[PDB]
Design a protein around this motif. Structure first.
Motif, PDB file in Angstrom:
ATOM      1  N   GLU A   1       0.843  -1.184   0.000  1.00  0.00           N
ATOM      2  CA  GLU A   1       0.000   0.000   0.000  1.00  0.00           C
ATOM      3  C   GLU A   1       0.883   1.240   0.000  1.00  0.00           C
ATOM      4  O   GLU A   1       1.963   1.254   0.595  1.00  0.00           O
TER       5      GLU A   1
ATOM      6  N   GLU B   1     -13.232  -3.099 -10.449  1.00  0.00           N
ATOM      7  CA  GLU B   1     -13.407  -2.416  -9.172  1.00  0.00           C
ATOM      8  C   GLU B   1     -12.386  -2.893  -8.146  1.00  0.00           C
ATOM      9  O   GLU B   1     -11.918  -2.107  -7.315  1.00  0.00           O
ATOM     10  N   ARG B   2     -12.031  -4.179  -8.191  1.00  0.00           N
ATOM     11  CA  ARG B   2     -11.044  -4.710  -7.257  1.00  0.00           C
ATOM     12  C   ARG B   2      -9.667  -4.098  -7.484  1.00  0.00           C
ATOM     13  O   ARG B   2      -8.915  -3.896  -6.524  1.00  0.00           O
TER      14      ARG B   2
ATOM     15  N   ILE C   1      -9.140  -1.058  -8.555  1.00  0.00           N
ATOM     16  CA  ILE C   1      -9.171   0.354  -8.183  1.00  0.00           C
ATOM     17  C   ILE C   1      -8.688   0.544  -6.751  1.00  0.00           C
ATOM     18  O   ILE C   1      -7.900   1.454  -6.462  1.00  0.00           O
ATOM     19  N   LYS C   2      -9.151  -0.308  -5.834  1.00  0.00           N
ATOM     20  CA  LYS C   2      -8.791  -0.150  -4.429  1.00  0.00           C
ATOM     21  C   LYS C   2      -7.299  -0.360  -4.205  1.00  0.00           C
ATOM     22  O   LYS C   2      -6.660   0.404  -3.472  1.00  0.00           O
ATOM     23  N   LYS C   3      -6.721  -1.388  -4.832  1.00  0.00           N
ATOM     24  CA  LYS C   3      -5.309  -1.685  -4.613  1.00  0.00           C
ATOM     25  C   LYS C   3      -4.414  -0.654  -5.290  1.00  0.00           C
ATOM     26  O   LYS C   3      -3.438  -0.180  -4.697  1.00  0.00           O
TER      27      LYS C   3
ATOM     28  N   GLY D   1      -5.131   2.519  -6.485  1.00  0.00           N
ATOM     29  CA  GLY D   1      -5.341   3.867  -6.005  1.00  0.00           C
ATOM     30  C   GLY D   1      -6.436   4.568  -6.777  1.00  0.00           C
ATOM     31  O   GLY D   1      -7.065   4.009  -7.675  1.00  0.00           O
ATOM     32  N   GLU D   2      -6.663   5.830  -6.407  1.00  0.00           N
ATOM     33  CA  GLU D   2      -7.703   6.621  -7.054  1.00  0.00           C
ATOM     34  C   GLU D   2      -7.301   7.100  -8.442  1.00  0.00           C
ATOM     35  O   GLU D   2      -8.180   7.460  -9.234  1.00  0.00           O
TER      36      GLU D   2
END
Ligand SMILES: CCCCCCCC(=O)OC[C@H](COP(=O)(O)O[C@@H]1[C@H](O)[C@H](O)[C@@H](OP(=O)(O)O)[C@H](OP(=O)(O)O)[C@H]1O)OC(=O)CCCCCCC
Lengths: 113, 355, 25, 319, 117, 107
Positions: free
Chosen positions: A46, B88-89, B91-93, B95-96
């Motif tokens: 992250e 969609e999966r 996108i979260k990992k 980033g925006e």
């Protein structure tokens, strides 16, 4: 034939200061954005800090105002500082381009005391 | 799970692909999904375009058969298509800054199929393939360089249907010279669906109640490739051949079976043989049969691969000398050779890599 | 044949040429 | 025999002697008839290649299985035989006469050794040329007319009417060729009654075709209105080609039997091979359609066969 | 499906043995054949492999040149010609099977024959 | 540079039904070409899982595998008495196919 070599890491007490640095040979990041990626035991990578070539620094919401990041073209090394350490921030730190390219390495693990 | 990445040479761009191949059904084709990442401080008055162009390579030229343009730039249109779970999966990992893109391959399109170059041929690809590229340009007419864009190659494949079909059989009756009894030859297969590498069996019931004797029986499997660029032209490829020196006496019956297996181990030296689409220099197997809706070819402008085993029954022309006299009685047995339904994504290379 | 008779008419030309051949020698 | 008569008189005169001791007409015939000689020679020579080329296409291609087209090829064998027969006899006759000119007549050895074999074939070809025009008319009768049996049990008789008629009617002329005439090639004009045994087999074939021609045209025209589907399939294609060859070839000698006329006959007869070849092997649609199919494949083969990108990676993904 | 292999026994250094591997229920063109040996008390080790569909033939470095593997599609058997033994090469050999297309590991294994030098 | 794969735990001792976890590392990075095998004394090896995530046919559901980076782990939910055997690693990304050192469980 690019390789990622980074220095810094050890046992430090809470709220300490280190000098996490990395050198990137081969490809030159004169314009592209450099980022410092963070790991977690049992979780995935992250992003916490990403520095650019124009000084437009940004940081993650969970790591907001915790520290600062800097870059310098000469000898193509970027730096990252420790401030206000907390015990939940214990993992291996990765350095990589914003596009996750450039032969993702292994890094060294840093832990609180 | 794992995804696929294609980093730009300059390191300021990358594209994420969920899977390489895309199964193409009878009526609908699986949509192409992915997410493209563009580094910050690089999109100011800049736009990002992703294409799904497909062309049939010529050698050294190419002709475009299907091109689609989708804009994944930070300027987003008001009409937004729904996002799949895979997009969609990511996108979260990521980033925006991650910008998903989608594609819709129209039905009745040629599959990713290539041909064998040959001994003296160069390394350029001769078959057709699908390409995905991402680049930054002010407009479509603006030129795009090579080091400022990515080049991801994908393939479209088809799998064997789950519904078995009717058993294939052939009937023939070839009359000899003016006075003779009819010649009856039978040929059939156990089933029409054959997996790649699976043995093929042909059954023959020939009853020659005529004076003319029967020479050696020929068993062969031929691959059809109707490559069309501006004109319709077919090609012949004897993938499997069998020699049987058996003979049938006049006014006698015969019955025997033969087993074959189509492979390119002995067909490497052949030129023009149809093979499945290859992303790299790694070799693949023989091209699978191309299922069609059968309503209308409508000038598909591609390569369609068909298989059928041919039995040839040459007569020795008994009676007069007839040393060079020989009539070939033959029938065609259509069949389908395709990969079965899988449970995992195939590796697009030899699993044990020689390196 | 109509042309066949005309071909036979050429034989007179050869016969005339044959007489001239002996005369020339 | 004019040359032989001079030689006989010269030999007798020479032996006896030793014991005792319009210019313009020849110029016109030589120059003018040279043009007529080449006028029909070029037509046969051009047709000779066309017939061989047309025959090569039918035999070479894989469409020889069908008897509808294969019967055309064997008809072409009669045209090529006749065209070659006229070509060889002209060359040998020219060779024999040229030898007697520059290259005292008994010294030359070999004058009509090939004339006899060529003369019978030339007569064999013409009578068999219209014999196969008869079989085509009757064969087409059972395709476009009422029939039940397939294209079988009649092919044996087809060969018995094609070459069968020039097998018991041309051999009497072979006997008469050497007997009662024997004029140096068995071809002359002494008696007009000997041609009656050649023209009548040809005449019989022409009239019996006219019997078929009237029958076939009235059957097709009446049935054309309801369910014929004109030009849709091969049924009408054979009608166009065959129904024009039957009368055109038949009336060519009918008017001739009943020097301007000579030129017209030779000009028309020279192009007979070309006319039959284009209508049956070139203008026909399926042979034309299949011919370009292989041309397309040959053209397509030539164009196809003429003589820092970073690697793909991967990353983890959260479920 | 079940497959059985045999053709091993006590030998002397420098000898030569031929190992036959009978296969039933599958062919050699649609299924690659691999040979895996296991030293007594040690782990597994791969020595050779064959894929008749592509004709590829591979051998381990320790057995390169010595060993020749061939498959006869007529009787559907896997054959391994092994020559010039030393003491360190003794082990138990397993004639395993793998899918030539859609490789998913060594699903099928042979009974196993002991080789003693 | 042949790939060497090593397993840190030489042997595991556990009761019946307790959770047991194992690890298996590789010298060089392998995407997914990892297969797990088990064998018993006087018996042929049997395949358990392939690609480190997929489950083979005919195997009890108590066997689960996963990957995280360069290491590969095999986890057993309930340790049945019949499960006491020896386990091995395997990689098939390249032609020098190498197996693991070997781990044995007993009780
Ligand atoms: C009476 C003999 C008939 C005869 O002479 O063949 C015609 C052929 C031209 O036909 P063409 O080249 O297309 O002939 C192909 C081929 O030679 C065989 O006849 C058939 O294949 P196979 O080998 O049987 O597997 C093949 O397929 P099919 O259509 O039969 O399926 C044919 O298409 O000529 C020659 O074979 C070489 C001639 C010199 C040029």
């Amino acid at each position: 034939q690019v390789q990622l070599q980074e220095s810094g890491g050890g046992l430090v007490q809470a709220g300490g200061s280190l000098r996490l640095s990395c050198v990137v040979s081969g490809f030159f990041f004169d314009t592209v954005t450099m980022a410092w990626y963070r790991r977690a035991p049992g979780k995935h990578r992250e992003l916490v800090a990403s520095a650019t070539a124009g000084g437009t620094t940004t940081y993650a919401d969970s790591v907001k105002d915790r520290f600062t990041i800097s870059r310098d073209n000469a000898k193509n090394t970027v730096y990252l500082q420790m401030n206000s350490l907390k015990p939940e921030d214990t993992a291996v730190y990765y350095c990589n381009t914003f596009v996750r390219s450039l032969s993702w390495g292994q890094g060294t693990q840093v832990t609180v005391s | 799970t794992r995804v696929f990445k294609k980093a730009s040479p300059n390191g300021k761009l990358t594209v994420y692909l969920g899977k390489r191949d895309f199964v193409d059904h009878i009526d609908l084709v699986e949509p192409v999904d992915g997410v493209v990442l563009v580094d910050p401080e690089y999109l100011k008055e800049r736009r990002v375009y992703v294409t799904l162009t497909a062309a049939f390579r010529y050698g050294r030229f190419r002709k475009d058969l299907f091109v689609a343009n989708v804009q994944s730039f930070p300027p987003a249109p008001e009409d937004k298509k729904p996002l799949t779970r895979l997009q969609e999966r990511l996108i979260k990992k990521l980033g925006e800054h991650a910008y998903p893109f989608t594609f819709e391959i129209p039905p009745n399109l040629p599959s990713s199929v290539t041909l064998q170059p040959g001994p003296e041929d160069t390394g350029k690809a001769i078959g057709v393939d699908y390409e995905v590229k991402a680049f930054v340009a002010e407009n479509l007419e603006e030129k795009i360089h090579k080091r400022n864009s990515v080049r991801l190659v994908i393939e479209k494949v088809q799998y064997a249907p789950e519904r078995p079909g009717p058993q294939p059989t052939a009937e023939t009756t070839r009359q000899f010279l003016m006075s003779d009894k009819p010649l009856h030859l039978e040929a059939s297969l156990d089933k029409e669906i054959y997996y790649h590498g699976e043995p093929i069996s042909v059954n023959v019931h020939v009853t020659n109640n005529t004076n003319k004797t029967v020479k050696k029986i020929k068993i062969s499997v031929r691959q059809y490739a109707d490559i069309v660029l501006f004109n319709t032209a077919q090609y012949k490829v004897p993938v499997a051949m069998e020699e049987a020196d058996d003979t049938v006496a006049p006014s006698s019956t015969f019955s025997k079976v033969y087993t074959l297996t189509p492979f390119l181990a002995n067909n490497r030296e052949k030129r023009g043989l149809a093979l499945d689409g290859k992303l790299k220099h790694e070799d693949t197997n023989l091209a699978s049969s191309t299922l069609l809706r059968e309503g209308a070819n409508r000038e598909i402008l591609g390569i369609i691969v068909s298989y059928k085993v041919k039995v040839k029954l040459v007569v020795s022309r008994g009676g007069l000398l007839g040393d060079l006299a020989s009539s070939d009685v033959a029938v065609e047995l259509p069949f389908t050779l395709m990969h079965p339904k899988p449970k995992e994504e195939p590796p697009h290379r030899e699993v044990p890599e020689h390196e | 044949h109509s042309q066949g008779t005309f071909t036979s008419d050429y034989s007179k030309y050869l016969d005339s040429r044959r007489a001239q051949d002996f005369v020339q020698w | 025999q004019v040359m032989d008569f001079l030689f006989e008189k010269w030999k007798l005169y020479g032996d006896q002697c030793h014991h005792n001791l319009e210019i313009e007409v020849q110029k016109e015939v030589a120059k003018m008839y040279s043009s007529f000689q080449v006028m029909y020679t070029v037509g046969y020579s051009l047709s000779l290649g066309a017939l061989l080329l047309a025959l090569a296409i039918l035999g070479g291609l894989s469409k020889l299985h069908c008897t509808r087209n294969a019967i055309h090829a064997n008809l072409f064998a009669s045209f090529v035989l006749k065209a070659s027969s006229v070509l060889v006899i002209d060359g040998l006759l020219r060779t024999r006469y040229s030898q007697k000119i520059g290259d005292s007549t008994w010294l030359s050895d070999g004058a009509v050794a090939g004339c006899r074999v060529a003369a019978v074939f030339m007569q064999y070809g013409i009578v068999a040329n219209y014999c196969w025009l008869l079989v085509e008319g009757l064969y087409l009768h059972n395709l476009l007319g009422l029939a039940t049996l397939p294209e079988r049990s009649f092919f044996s008789l087809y060969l018995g009417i094609g070459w069968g008629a020039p097998m018991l009617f041309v051999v009497p002329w072979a006997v008469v060729k050497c007997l009662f005439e024997n004029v140096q090639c068995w071809t002359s004009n002494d008696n007009m009654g000997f041609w009656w045994i050649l023209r009548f087999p040809v005449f019989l074939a022409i009239l019996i075709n006219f019997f078929i021609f009237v029958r076939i045209v009235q059957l097709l025209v009446a049935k054309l209105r309801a369910r014929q589907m004109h030009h849709t399939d091969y049924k009408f294609r054979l009608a166009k080609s065959t129904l024009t060859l039957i009368p055109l070839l038949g009336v060519h000698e009918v008017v001739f039997a009943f020097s301007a006329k000579l030129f017209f006959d030779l000009f028309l007869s020279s192009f007979q091979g070309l006319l039959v070849a284009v209508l049956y092997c070139f203008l026909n649609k399926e042979v034309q359609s299949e011919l370009r199919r292989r041309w397309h494949r040959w053209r397509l083969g030539k164009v196809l066969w003429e003589e820092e990108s970073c690697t793909t990676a991967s990353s983890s993904l959260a479920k």
